[PDB]
Amino acid sequence: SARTSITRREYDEWVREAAALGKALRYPITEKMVNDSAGIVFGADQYDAFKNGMWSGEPYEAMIIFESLNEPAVDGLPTGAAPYAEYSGLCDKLMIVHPGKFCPPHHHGRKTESYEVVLGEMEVFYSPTPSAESGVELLNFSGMPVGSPWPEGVALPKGRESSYEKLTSYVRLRAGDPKFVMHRKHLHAFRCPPDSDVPLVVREVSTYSHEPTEAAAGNHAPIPSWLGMHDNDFVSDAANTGRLQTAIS
Amino acid sequence: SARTSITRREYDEWVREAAALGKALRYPITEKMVNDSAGIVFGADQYDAFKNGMWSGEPYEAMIIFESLNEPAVDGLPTGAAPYAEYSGLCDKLMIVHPGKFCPPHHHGRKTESYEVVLGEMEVFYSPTPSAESGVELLNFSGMPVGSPWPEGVALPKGRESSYEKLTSYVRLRAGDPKFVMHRKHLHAFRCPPDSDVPLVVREVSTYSHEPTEAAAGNHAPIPSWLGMHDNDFVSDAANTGRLQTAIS
Amino acid sequence: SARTSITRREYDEWVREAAALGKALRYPITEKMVNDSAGIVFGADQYDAFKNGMWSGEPYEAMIIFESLNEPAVDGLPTGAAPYAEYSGLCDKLMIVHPGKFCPPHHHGRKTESYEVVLGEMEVFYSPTPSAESGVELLNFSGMPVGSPWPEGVALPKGRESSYEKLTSYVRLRAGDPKFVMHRKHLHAFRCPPDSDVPLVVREVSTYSHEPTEAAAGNHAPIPSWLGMHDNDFVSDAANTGRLQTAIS
Amino acid sequence: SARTSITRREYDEWVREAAALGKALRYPITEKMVNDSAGIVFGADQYDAFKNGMWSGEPYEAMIIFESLNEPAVDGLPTGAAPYAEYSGLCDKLMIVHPGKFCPPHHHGRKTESYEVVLGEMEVFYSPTPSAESGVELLNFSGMPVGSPWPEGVALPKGRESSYEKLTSYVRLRAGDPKFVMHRKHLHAFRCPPDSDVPLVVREVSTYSHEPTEAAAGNHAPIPSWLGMHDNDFVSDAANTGRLQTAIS
Numbered sequence: 001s002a003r004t005s006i007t008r009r010e011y012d013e014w015v016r017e018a019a020a021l022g023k024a025l026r027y028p029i030t031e032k033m034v035n036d037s038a039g040i041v042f043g044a045d046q047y048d049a050f051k052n053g054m055w056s057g058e059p060y061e062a063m064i065i066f067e068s069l070n071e072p073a074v075d076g077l078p079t080g081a082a083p084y085a086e087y088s089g090l091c092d093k094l095m096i097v098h099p100g101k102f103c104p105p106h107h108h109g110r111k112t113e114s115y116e117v118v119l120g121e122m123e124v125f126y127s128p129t130p131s132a133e134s135g136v137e138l139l140n141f142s143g144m145p146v147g148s149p150w151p152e153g154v155a156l157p158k159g160r161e162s163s164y165e166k167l168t169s170y171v172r173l174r175a176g177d178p179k180f181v182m183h184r185k186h187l188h189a190f191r192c193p194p195d196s197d198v199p200l201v202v203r204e205v206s207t208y209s210h211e212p213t214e215a216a217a218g219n220h221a222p223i224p225s226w227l228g229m230h231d232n233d234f235v236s237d238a239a240n241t242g243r244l245q246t247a248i249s
Numbered sequence: 250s251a252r253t254s255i256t257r258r259e260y261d262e263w264v265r266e267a268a269a270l271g272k273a274l275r276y277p278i279t280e281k282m283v284n285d286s287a288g289i290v291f292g293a294d295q296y297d298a299f300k301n302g303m304w305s306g307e308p309y310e311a312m313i314i315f316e317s318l319n320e321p322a323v324d325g326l327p328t329g330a331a332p333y334a335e336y337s338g339l340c341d342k343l344m345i346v347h348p349g350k351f352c353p354p355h356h357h358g359r360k361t362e363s364y365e366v367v368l369g370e371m372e373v374f375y376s377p378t379p380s381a382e383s384g385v386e387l388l389n390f391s392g393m394p395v396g397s398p399w400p401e402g403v404a405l406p407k408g409r410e411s412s413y414e415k416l417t418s419y420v421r422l423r424a425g426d427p428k429f430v431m432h433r434k435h436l437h438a439f440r441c442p443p444d445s446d447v448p449l450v451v452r453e454v455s456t457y458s459h460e461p462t463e464a465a466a467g468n469h470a471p472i473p474s475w476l477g478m479h480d481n482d483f484v485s486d487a488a489n490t491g492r493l494q495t496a497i498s
Numbered sequence: 499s500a501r502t503s504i505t506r507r508e509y510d511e512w513v514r515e516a517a518a519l520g521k522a523l524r525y526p527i528t529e530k531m532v533n534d535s536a537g538i539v540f541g542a543d544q545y546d547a548f549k550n551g552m553w554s555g556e557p558y559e560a561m562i563i564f565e566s567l568n569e570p571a572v573d574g575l576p577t578g579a580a581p582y583a584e585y586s587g588l589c590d591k592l593m594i595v596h597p598g599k600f601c602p603p604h605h606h607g608r609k610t611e612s613y614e615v616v617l618g619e620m621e622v623f624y625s626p627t628p629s630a631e632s633g634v635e636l637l638n639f640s641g642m643p644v645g646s647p648w649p650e651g652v653a654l655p656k657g658r659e660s661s662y663e664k665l666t667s668y669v670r671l672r673a674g675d676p677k678f679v680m681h682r683k684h685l686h687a688f689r690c691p692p693d694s695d696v697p698l699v700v701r702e703v704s705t706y707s708h709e710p711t712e713a714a715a716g717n718h719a720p721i722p723s724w725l726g727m728h729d730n731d732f733v734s735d736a737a738n739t740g741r742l743q744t745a746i747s
Numbered sequence: 748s749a750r751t752s753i754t755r756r757e758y759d760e761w762v763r764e765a766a767a768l769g770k771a772l773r774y775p776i777t778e779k780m781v782n783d784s785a786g787i788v789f790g791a792d793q794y795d796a797f798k799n800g801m802w803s804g805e806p807y808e809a810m811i812i813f814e815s816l817n818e819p820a821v822d823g824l825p826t827g828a829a830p831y832a833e834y835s836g837l838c839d840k841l842m843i844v845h846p847g848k849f850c851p852p853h854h855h856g857r858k859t860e861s862y863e864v865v866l867g868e869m870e871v872f873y874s875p876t877p878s879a880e881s882g883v884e885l886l887n888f889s890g891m892p893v894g895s896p897w898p899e900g901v902a903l904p905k906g907r908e909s910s911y912e913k914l915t916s917y918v919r920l921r922a923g924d925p926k927f928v929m930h931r932k933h934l935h936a937f938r939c940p941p942d943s944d945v946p947l948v949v950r951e952v953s954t955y956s957h958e959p960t961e962a963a964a965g966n967h968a969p970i971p972s973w974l975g976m977h978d979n980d981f982v983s984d985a986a987n988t989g990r991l992q993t994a995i996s
C-alpha cells in the first residue's frame with residue numbers, strides 16, 4: 001500500500017493552497033510559477049507523506065518551491081569570468097514546508113543560500129565545515145558559525161535517518177531574524193517543527209540554481225558548460241532522483 | 250534659505266516611520282539596519298526636499314534603504330574566481346521612495362539588480378543598451394528589454410533634468426509582477442509616482458553592493474581588491490558625493 | 499456514491515490550511531477558534547463538494563468561519579433595552595470561501611452584517627428590500643442600495659438554484675473597498691468567483707450571532723430569551739439543518 | 748513657546764504616513780478616511796507633542812483614527828427598540844498611537860468597544876467597575892476582568908496624571924491575542940510603550956460612535972434623539988474640547 005505517486009487532487013490542493021498562502025504573505029507568485037514542478041517529493045518512499053497528508057505532522061522529505069527568479073547574471077560580465085559565472089547569479093524563491101516535513105540533507109558545489117523566515121519557524125541542520133573538493137584550493141572569508149547542538153526528540157524520516165548524521169550544527173530561525181547565510185559546499189537540511197500551527201514559509205535568496213528539472217528542461221544556456229550542469233548533491237540517493245520530477249497520477 | 254542638511258527630527262521621523270512600514274510589509278528589519286545611513290539624500294541641493302517634506306510630492310533625489318544582506322559569497326569559491334567574485338555576492342534590501350522622489354540616474358560596473366514592488370508602483374527609467382567598457386569583451390545572454398517610451402508629464406529634479414536624457418526606456422512595475430532584472434552596466438533610475446497615496450516600497454535582490462559608505466566604513470575585505478572599491482556611477486556628479494553620507498544637523 | 503460526510507483528513511487540511519491563511523492575513527486566530535465547527539457544509543447533498551475537493555471550482559454551499567468575537571454587549575445596558583439587546587452585540591469573524599463555493603441564501607431577523615474583503619473578490623447576491631415581518635412596524639434609515647443585475651454565467655449549486663431567485667441585486671466587492679452593510683431582514687448570499695486563484699477571505703463585523711451551533715452549545719445566556727434563540731433563516735431547508743453541525747467521519 | 752496648533756506639514760506627514768501603514772497592514776483605508784479629523788490632539792496643552800514630534804517617545808495625549816464604518820444599524824429594528832438603538836450599531840476603525848502617546852482616560856455611556864492589536868503592543872489602563880448611572884438599573888452579564896496592577900515607570904502626560912488615578916487595572920495586549928472587550932460605562936485609556944520601534948496599530952470594533960466631530964458635522968440622524976448626542980466623557984476637561992477639532996495652522 002506504499003504510495004508511489006500523488007493524485008492530481010492532492011497535488012493541486014497542496015500547491016494551490018500554498019500559492020495562496022504565498023500571496024497573502026506578499027510573495028509575487030505568477031501563474032507560471034504555480035506548476036507541476038513546484039510540489040516536490042524527495043524519493044519514491046516519500047510519497048507516503050500523502051497517506052495521512054501534509055497536516056499529519058509525520059516526518060517525510062517533501063516541500064514546495066515557487067521560484068520567482070533564477071537570473072544567470074551573465075550579461076555585462078568580462079569574458080574571463082565565464083568559467084566562474086556559475087557560482088553567481090540571483091535566485092529568489094518561496095519555500096513552503098509543512099509540519100514535520102523536511103528539505104533533505106544535501107549540499108551545493110556552487111550555490112550559496114540565505115534564508116528569511118516569513119511564517120512559522122525554521123529548524124536548520126547543517127555541517128559547519130564545507131565539503132573538501134579534491135585537487136582545488138578554495139577561498140575563505142566568514143565560514144559558517146558553529147551554531148548549537150540539536151534539540152532532543154527530532155523525528156527523522158524512516159530510512160533517511162543516517163543522511164542527517166553529519167549535519168550536527170543546528171539553529172532555529174524566526175521571522176524578523178537577521179538573514180541566514182548557508183555557504184556553498186555546506187551540508188544542510190531544514191524542517192518545520194511538527195507542532196507548528198502553520199506551514200513554514202521561507203524566502204530564499206541565493207546564487208543561480210543549476211537544476212535540469214521538469215519545469216526547467218528546454219531553456220537556453222547562458223554559458224556552454226551550464227548546459228545539463230547539476231548542482232544538487234543529496235546525501236540520500238533516493239532524494240536526488242525524485243527531486244527532478246513529481247509523479248502525479 | 251536652501252537647506253544644506255536634515256534635522257535630527259526630520260531624519261528620525263522619516264527613517265523610523267519607514268522602518269515601521271517595512272515591518273508591516275514583513276521585511277526583516279533589525280535594529281542595526283535602522284541607522285543614520287539608511288536615509289539618503291543625493292547631493293547638497295537635494296536637501297531642499299525637506300523644505301516642504303517627503304509628502305510634498307516634489308521632484309527630489311532622496312530615498313531610504315534598509316539593507317538586510319550584503320553577502321560576498323566568497324566562501325567555497327575556487328581561487329581562480331577571485332578576480333571575478335566582485336560581480337557576484339548577494340544583496341537584499343528594502344527601498345522606500347516617497348511620492349515624486351527619485352533614486353537618481355546611475356549605473357553599476359559589477360552589480361546586477363532585480364526589483365520586486367511590495368507597495369505602491371515603481372516607475373523605472375533606463376537605457377536598454379549597456380555602457381561600453383573600453384578595452385574589454387563582455388558576455389551577453391538576455392540583454393535588457395526595450396520597454397516603452399516615457400509617459401508624459403514626468404517632473405524631474407531642478408538642475409538634474411539632463412541626467413535622465415539617456416534613460417529613454419520606461420516601465421511601470423507593480424506588486425505581483427514578474428521580478429524585474431536590471432543588468433549591470435545599464436543606466437537606471439526610478440521614482441514613486443507623485444500622486445501616490447503610499448510610499449513606493451521595493452525589495453531589491455542583487456549581487457554584492459560595493460559601497461564604502463558611512464555604515465560600511467571599517468569592515469573586513471573578503472578579497473584584497475574589494476577594499477575601497479566603488480561600484481556606483483551617478484550621471485550627476487552632485488549625486489555621487491552626498492550618496493555616501495547624510496548631513497544630519 | 500454521494501458523499502454524506504467529510505473525512506477527518508479532508509476536514510483538517512481544509513480548516514487548518516484556512517487558519518494559516520487567516521494568520522498570514524493578520525486575523526487573530528486562536529487555538530480554540532480552529533475547531534470542528536469552523537468548517538461548514540450546508541446540507542447533506544453539499545458534502546459532494548469533497549468528491550473533487552475545494553479547488554475543483556464546482557458550485558457547492560460550504561465555507562469556513564473563524565469567530566474571534568461574539569460579544570452580547572449586554573453589560574451596562576438600561577434594563578428597558580433587555581428585549582431589544584438581541585439586535586445589538588458585536589460579532590467579528592473571518593470567512594473563507596473557495597472558488598465556486600457559496601455562503602447560501604438566507605436572512606437574519608436580528609443580525610446586521612458588514613463585509614471587508616481581505617483576499618480575493620466577493621460576489622454578493624441579495625434582495626434590496628427587507629422581508630416584511632407580519633404585525634410589526636420597523637424603523638428605516640438608509641435601506642439597501644439597488645446594486646447591479648447579476649453578471650452572466652453564474653453557476654449555482656445543483657438543486658439549490660431556485661433558492662437564489664429573489665436575490666436579484668448583485669455587487670462585487672474587493673480589498674480596499676468601502677465597508678459593505680447588509681441590513682438585517684435582507685436575503686443574501688455570496689461566493690468566490692470560480693476562476694479565482696485564491697480563496698475568498700472576508701472579515702465580517704456584525705451584531706451578535708444567535709446560533710445554537712456545535713461549538714456554541716452549552717454556554718450561558720446573557721438574557722433569558724436569548725436561550726435557544728435562532729437567527730438564521732436559510733431559503734433552502736437543506737441548508738438550515740447541516741449548518742449547525744458538520745459530519746466528520 | 749507652547750505649541751497651540753499643528754502645522755499643515757506636521758499634520759499631513761503624521762496622518763498620510765499612518766494611512767500608508769494602515770494599508771500595509773491591510774486595513775481598508777479610503778480617500779475620504781484620510782482627512783483633517785483623523786489626527787487627534789486631546790487639548791491645547793497636548794499640541795506640545797509636536798515640539799519634538801511623534802517619535803520623541805514623550806507622554807502626550809494624541810492619536811490617529813481612520814474610521815471605516817459607523818453604521819447605526821437602525822434599519823429593520825422594531826419601533827420599540829428606538830430609544831435603545833443608540834447602544835447598538837457597528838463602528839470599525841483603525842487607531843494609531845505612537846510611542847509614549849495615549850488615548851486619554853474616558854468612558855462611554857453607550858459604546859462598548861473591543862480591541863485587536865495589529866502591530867506593536869497595547870497597554871490598556873481601566874476601571875474594572877462601571878460608572879454608576881444615578882436613577883437607572885443596568886443589565887449585567889460578564890462584567891470586566893480585574894486584570895493586573897500597573898507595571899512600574901509609566902510616564903503620564905504632564906498635568907494629566909490624576910486623570911489616570913481610577914484606571915487601576917492594567918493589561919498588555921499583543922497581535923494574535925483574544926479580542927479584548929471594554930464594556931460601556933468603564934473608564935479606559937491606552938498607550939503605545941515608549942520604547943516601541945513601531946507605532947501601536949489597533950483595530951477597534953465597537954457599537955455606534957456618537958460624536959458630533961468635525962468630519963461628522965452635517966449628516967442625517969437615523970433617530971431624532973441621536974442628533975447632537977454626545978457619548979464621550981473624558982476625565983480631563985481639556986481632553987473633551989480638543990477632541991472634536993484639530994488646530995492645523
Ligand SMILES: OC[C@@H](O)[C@@H](O)[C@@H](O)CO
Pocket residue numbers: 065093103113188204232243
Ligand atoms: O531542493 C532544494 C532547493 O534546491 C532549495 O532551493 C535549496 O537547495 C534548499 O536548501
Ligand SMILES: OC[C@@H](O)[C@@H](O)[C@@H](O)CO
Pocket residue numbers: 143144145178179180181182183
Ligand atoms: O548575522 C549572521 C547570521 O545570523 C548567521 O550567523 C550567518 O548568516 C550564518 O551564515
Ligand SMILES: OC[C@@H](O)[C@@H](O)[C@@H](O)CO
Pocket residue numbers: 314342352362437453481492
Ligand atoms: O543608491 C542606490 C542603491 O545602490 C540601490 O541599491 C540601487 O543601486 C538602485 O538601483
Ligand SMILES: OC[C@@H](O)[C@@H](O)[C@@H](O)CO
Pocket residue numbers: 392393394427428429430431432
Ligand atoms: O520576466 C521578465 C521581466 O518582466 C523583465 O522584462 C526583465 O526582468 C527585464 O530585465
Ligand SMILES: OC[C@@H](O)[C@@H](O)[C@@H](O)CO
Pocket residue numbers: 563591601611686702730741
Ligand atoms: O452561516 C453564515 C454565517 O451566519 C455568517 O456569519 C453570515 O450569516 C453570512 O452572511
Ligand SMILES: OC[C@@H](O)[C@@H](O)[C@@H](O)CO
Pocket residue numbers: 641642643676677678679680681
Ligand atoms: O459606502 C456604502 C457601501 O459601499 C454600500 O453601498 C453599503 O454599505 C450597502 O449597504
Ligand SMILES: OC[C@@H](O)[C@@H](O)[C@@H](O)CO
Pocket residue numbers: 812840850860935951979990
Ligand atoms: O477618542 C477615542 C475614540 O472614541 C476611540 O474610538 C475609543 O473611544 C477609544 O477607547
Ligand SMILES: OC[C@@H](O)[C@@H](O)[C@@H](O)CO
Pocket residue numbers: 890891892925926927928929930
Ligand atoms: O477572552 C477574554 C478577553 O481576553 C478579555 O479578558 C475580555 O475581552 C475583557 O473584557
Ligand SMILES: [Co+2]
Pocket residue numbers: 106107108113188
Ligand atoms: Co540547498
Ligand SMILES: [Co+2]
Pocket residue numbers: 355356357362437
Ligand atoms: Co542601482
Ligand SMILES: [Co+2]
Pocket residue numbers: 604605606611686
Ligand atoms: Co448572513
Ligand SMILES: [Co+2]
Pocket residue numbers: 853854855860935
Ligand atoms: Co473609548
